[model samples]
Every structure is written in C-alpha cells, then in structure tokens.
Target chain A: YHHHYGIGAVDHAALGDPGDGGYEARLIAELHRLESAQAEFLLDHLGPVGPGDTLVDAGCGRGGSMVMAHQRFGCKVEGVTLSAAQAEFGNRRARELGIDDHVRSRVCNMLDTPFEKGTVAASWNNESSMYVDLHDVFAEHSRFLRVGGRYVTVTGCWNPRYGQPSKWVSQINAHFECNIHSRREYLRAMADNRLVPQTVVDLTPETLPYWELRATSSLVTGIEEAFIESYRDGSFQYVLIAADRV
Target chain B: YHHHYGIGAVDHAALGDPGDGGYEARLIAELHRLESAQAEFLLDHLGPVGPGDTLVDAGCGRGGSMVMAHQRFGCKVEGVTLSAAQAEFGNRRARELGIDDHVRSRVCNMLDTPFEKGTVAASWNNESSMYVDLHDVFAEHSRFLRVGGRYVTVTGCWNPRYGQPSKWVSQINAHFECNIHSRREYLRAMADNRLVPQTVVDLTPETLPYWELRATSSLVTGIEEAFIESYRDGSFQYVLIAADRV
Candidate 1:
C-alpha cells in the first residue's frame, strides 16, 4: 500500500522556492538543478505543452514541478500522488496561486490511473519513479497517453554488473522501500509496452557533484554514499528517459 | 608569479554552458549556475549595468562571468587578471565574439588598478579575491569608484573559528599559494576601507551541495576536500558581499 512509502508520510510539505539557503534547500536545488534544460529537451522531443494541451504528473512531489510546468509551459496539469495530504497541499497551493483551474492534484497510484485511455497529452515524472513498478507503470502510461504522446521521466537505475546493490544502497532501498531497475531493463520495459524510447540521458555523471557536495559536509550517509558507490563502480545511475507511445 | 596559481595555468579553458551533463560540467555549472539569480541579486544591490555603463572585473576567471555580464546586462566591461595568458585568452574571446570594442581584458593587479579615479560605474569580482590583498583592493575600489558606485564580490572566507585551516585546506593553500581570510576580517577590512557593506550573504550553506556531490564521485581531493573540511569544522565559508563606495 502507498501507506507504506515514507514519502507519503510527510507528503504534504509545502512547495516553496527554498530560495538560496539551508541544508535541505540544497536537496531542492538538486531537484531543480537541470529542470530547465530537461524541460526544454522534452519540449524538443514531445513538442510543446502549451494552451489547450493537457499533461499528467506521475508521482508529482510537493507540486513544485507541476506548478513550474504549468506556469512555464502554459499547459493544464493533473498531478497524481499516492499521498492524499500531498494532493491537498498541492491543490491548496494551486488555489493560492490563482491557477487551480489549470493545475489540479489527486491521490492516485501511478500503476493504475483513473484517466480515460488516450486522454493525456504527456506524462511528466521528475525523479519519482524509484518506488514504481516500471513495467506496469509504462503500460499505464501508454494507455493514458494519446498515440504519439510522450512520457518523460527522471529516475535512478542500477548498473547491470553490480549484481546486488551495495550496503548503503540497500539501506536506502529499505528506508524508501523503493525498487531500482537496471538501465537496460528500464529501457526494455519501455519498448515492451509499445512506448518507443526517444532519448535516454545518463545524468548519473552530472548528478555526482550534488552528492559529492553532501558527502563533504560531514552529513554524508545512506543514500548519499550509495550514490557515490554506484557512480564510481557503475552500480547505479541517474537517468532521464523520453519516450513516445507508438 | 602567475605560474604560482593553479587556477591561472589553464584559466583560459572555455566557459561553455555544459548543457546539463557530467560531474565536471556541473562543477563549472556553479560558475554560471542560477546566474540570472546571482546577476539580479547583484543588480538589486548594485543597480543595473546597461549600455554606456562601464564595469570592472577585478578577478575575472576565464572571462566567463565578464561575458555573462556583458551578454545579460548589456554593459561595457574591462576584465583584469594577474595572468597575462588568461587576459589574452579572454581578450581574444571578446574579439572572436565581435564584442572586443565592448568587452576587454588586461593583466592588472586589483590592489593597484590602472584606471583613473571615479572612472568606472561598478566593480564586480567573482570568487577571485582570496589571493589578493583585500584592504588594498577595497581601497582601490573606493578610489576608482564614483561616489555611490557599487562594489560586488563573491569569495571564500574563514568562519572565524577553528583557529587554523585543516591539513587539506593547508594542502590547497600550498597548491594555490593563496591566503584565506576570516569572514569578520573580510567585512572589517571592507568597512575600514570605506566600502560600505550593504549585503554580506553567507553563501557557505548553499555551496555545500556543490562540494558534496563532488566528494561522493571520487572526483574530489585537494581543494574539494579542503572545502569539505573547512565547512564541516566551521572553519571555511563562501560569501557574497555587495557594497557601495561611500
């Protein structure tokens, strides 16, 4: 049950700019790090998501990205998360920002969406797929998306050669109760579901500096070390995948 | 003398946007990272730098910051550096971009600039002050700046405790052969020289993520570790000071 996911516990945290300060702010920065570039890249592949267009946000965290997507691209966004609290928070934020009509959120599982088949223009998931069942989710995405609809996601992938993840990764895995599929497996799953993979960006290297900064702060632990070990030994990677429904 | 600085040797390395890729690229990203925010932050304290205004880059590294200022603010800029090679490269770049008439570079020390008194509108230094004599440079800025002119700088500062820097910092100090000053010392020196400090934002916390991501990837050592140790022990900090010549 989504009740078991740790993220769902504090899922209703406010979506603020985080400005340019604090320890946790760095985590937010990492999330927003390549957002602009990533968005533009998706735009290039999936075409624009502007007026009259509708998109789905899979596992939308805190709704910051959803608001950004709606504001920046001028598209209608429906953000779905497992946490009802997060949905309430996001929807409240939408109302406060006077964009509730264009941006909405609801508690829903990504694996089984409530939308009609071939309804969504695209699905945008930013760094929230680790806890997902990729195979099942890809199928859901395909079903929800119109033909030629795009699926854009940023997630962590296991390096095939590392057999099992390191202790640090396992610790993080247990903490989040998430699953990390291999890079090859993630892509294969996309293809198997009739979603034609477009661009698969290996952002593992780019994201390294983020983790590196955390490690040096004497705040290094669990997920941070796991990120390092995976990057160094090719056991883990951060990836950006853009695919189109066939 | 310029050979003594590691940053000076290959300082002419291109300042490309890195296009959202690689660890090294992300490290470079900070130089231009949230650059718009940084520029606007400077604009808030320093006012706008538009056409017909002349700005000085006291420690322009590879000329990237200078170029960004020129491009974004549409201002005329003169970049000064101790390394003749870097200056030449920057100047050449300006010429190549057909902005040589507007943006230029020269080998000049900050402690004693060659400009006439009250000749420039503002002086911008991006993380290039640690190696210089702050007192002398502040005096120089005050002398060169017109009444009410702005002086903005982002640099490294000590947290004012831990007595001395760690071995890793010492190692980097020996490598760059540059001195690090305490934050209090830096501000006091700024005030003592009549550079009325308007904003002294402690950027130490925000900069941690950059170093943390670096350390985790095994791409860290030397100065990177130095950054970590300094931050961890409360001995090192990154600061941005925006002041006016009163």
Candidate 2:
C-alpha cells in the first residue's frame, strides 16, 4: 500500500481528538501513524526482499514493526525503542501476533547501543528523531547499518516558510511541549554524518488533504467515524523524509 | 544461588581479559564469590517455601539465590537482576541444574520494577539493598508485599562501630570502589521511612571467622584471587535482619 496521509490510511482522527482518549493514547496513536507510513514508504522504495535481509527500526516506538513489516516483506526485523512501556508493549504485541521468534522489541537508546558493526541491512525511523539530538541520531544509525544499508524515515519538522505563527507549528509545539527545529536543517545534518537523504517526499500537501476533509462540515460524520476507527492527525500535515545509511 | 562474581561459568575471556581472564572471566569469578556467600547466608535465614509460596529474589545477581532458594525450599522462584550477563549466566545454570521451569530470571531494575503488590509469599534481598536508594527501599518493598508478607535479608549495612575505620573498611572501599556508610545511619534512614527493623543479627562476628579462613596461605593461589577469596570482607558481613511491611 503506497499510501498517503490524505488517503486516511494512517487513522488521523485518533491523534488530536481528546474525546477519543488520553494524551498518551493520542501520543501512541500518532506515533503509530508515522510507523505505518514509514513501513509503506520502505516497502515502496526498497523492493521486496526474501528472508535474511535484516530490517531494523531505529527508533521503533513500540519496537514492534516486525510482523507488521514482515507479513508484507518477510525480512528479519529487530526494533529498538527507548520507552520501557513501548518496548514491553511491542514485545507483547509481537508475542500476541506469534512473531516473537522472528521479531523483538528492545528497551534501548540507539545513541550508545551495543550492536556489532555491519549487522543491520535496512532500518527505519518514524518521527522519533525530534526528541533526540539530530547529530547523535545519524551517528547511531551509522553504527547499525551494513554497507549499502537502506533507511527510511517519516519525520515531523518545522515548516520554514510559515515562520512562527502558524497554527500547525503552534499546535505541534504545544503537543510536543518542546522546542523543535526546521526541516531545512535536516539535509545539511544528514550530509555531515554521511547519511544522505535518498528521497524527500514533501508530504505536507498530501497530509493537508486529511485536514481539509475534517474541516469540511460534510465530513463531520466521516470524522466521527474516523475517530471511532482511530485515524491520527485528522487536521494537520507533517514532514516525511527518507534516507540511506552509507 | 543469590550469586555474584563467579568464574568457570561463562567464557569471560571474550570481552577482553587483561587479568586471569578478561572482563567476562573476572566478572564471572566475582559473581561466583557473591553467589557462594549469598547461598550460605540464605540457607540459614530464608527457609523453604512450598509450591504455594513464591520466592522472589530482588536484585538477584546471577539468579543463584532464586535457584538455590528454590532447590532448598521447593518454592517457585522469580529472580530479578539488572545485569544481562548475570541473567544469562544464571539462566544457563538453571538449565544445567534442571530447575529452568522452577525459576525465572528477569532482567529488571528494582528501583521502579513492575511487580504486582502482594503476590509472592516470601522474598529475598541478599546483599542488594546497599546499591538501592536507602530512602525508598522500604517503599519499594511495601509495593511488592501481601499482608503478612515475609522477608529475609542478608543485606549490607554500615556498622556504626566500624565508623572507627578498621583496616577492614579501607580494604573493602579500595576493593570495590564503593561508598560505605555506617549501619546506624542506614537503619535510621530506613526507620524514618516507616520500615522498622524487626530483628538484627550481628553477622560481623560470624562473618569474621570466614574471612579468617580466607587468610590461610595454604588455600591461596594467584595474589589477587587469593586475597579476595580468603577475605569475607565485603559489606556482606555487617547484618542480617528481617522485617514486615507496614
């Protein structure tokens, strides 16, 4: 599924809707949206691979992109995330899905993880680098990748043109409750670390459609159903970028 | 096996050993030493539990305590240890001893672990509480206990009398590179936090005999090993106490 946010594939109505759940519920739901988006992005860019092509999710929130990715691609997956809750949840979900033998989620900080050199073939990052020092993020990814390793990411970055007043930026800042950087800073940082951006899909336009739908009075019932069904970010756009670890 | 530094367990020669082995070898040896002391101490204190009685080894280093406690008492055991290496070694021991199902070694930190309150019948803390924040020790213990919960500890404490700075104290401080406090201060810290000390057994006199045996040149080998193996000089020799949660 080469999906886009506007296609309503990521379940946007779940993220910003307080009536749906707690802030935590919204947090995980929004994170999972990026997860699913990055998964589809990877499947599109890195043609199908058989067994033994190891795919690791660098900032895997639940550390559980395994079977969800494996069912479609059939590659060995190891997901790593920092939150103990996410790691436990991911591992539990993996076990529930009966893919524990093929997939594992770890409570780990990628910055100083103890992975052997050249052990990872492909990796993914889903809106996880915002909380990290971006330089450290690239350095950590570099340590895990095998030569010619591919990495994909769907990230949230500040929209430079809008300056500081846009509701999207304000809401994002409010949601995260932290200082965030601009998207323009990413390419230079990546090149400094030698993790070149393989593709930059300006996903803001596609993401805007989801917001447009929710803004439409005709889509009110549609939005409510989307809420029940767990669509995240029903009214916002986010940056999506992908890269390869060279 | 409530264990610590032991050799002849894992092949520690791999992680680099400038000494008798490398980090792993020396690490194993140290684990075994603690294991030996813990096993001996727990034997006299924490007795056997039936199948209905579950034995929890908090800060269970190498899971030796859980295994040994299970073997001696016939209780189901759950060992929580922070060291991945210790868990690995301990689980291997469980598998070797055919007590795999009877004991589970979890890689968990005791500070904010995820154990349900009031589940297990009896729990052990042999030589562990020293590393924990003394202030929260009782609170952490209370969270895991059922009413009338039983606990036996061969835990470390500062001997207020030993505040005189005996040769033993200096030997230990340099040996482990750890901060050693006096027992009265530690107990006061605990008592102020609402954890009363039920019975205090001065294991100092009892432990002194063991260190005397270690001093036997006839039992000696390599200089460092000979020095360490003979001396029962660890903070382990201070006190054995029991208490019930408030």
- Going through the candidates in the order shown, the clash numbers are 14, 41
Residue B3 shift from truth in candidate 1, angstroms: 15
Q: What share of the true interface contacts does each candidate keep?
A: 0.00, 0.00
User: Which portions of model 2 miss their true places by more than 4 Å?
Assistant: A1-38, A162-170, A211-237, B1-246
lDDT of 1 by residue, B41-150 (tens): 55455566668888888877567667767887788888888888898988888889988888988888887888889888889767677787778878888888877677
Per-residue CA lDDT of model 2 for A196-242, tens digit only, reads 77787766554544444344323243333322221143222355556
Give the candidate number with the greatest lDDT. Answer: 1
lDDT of 2 at A96: 85
- Model 2, range B1-246, lDDT digits (tens) per residue? 333321123232342444433454454444446447646665555534577687677888777667767777777888888789888998898899998988888798766667787786767667676555555655666667666666666744544442222334433433443333447655776566445566667655544433333333233332333224323444324566766555
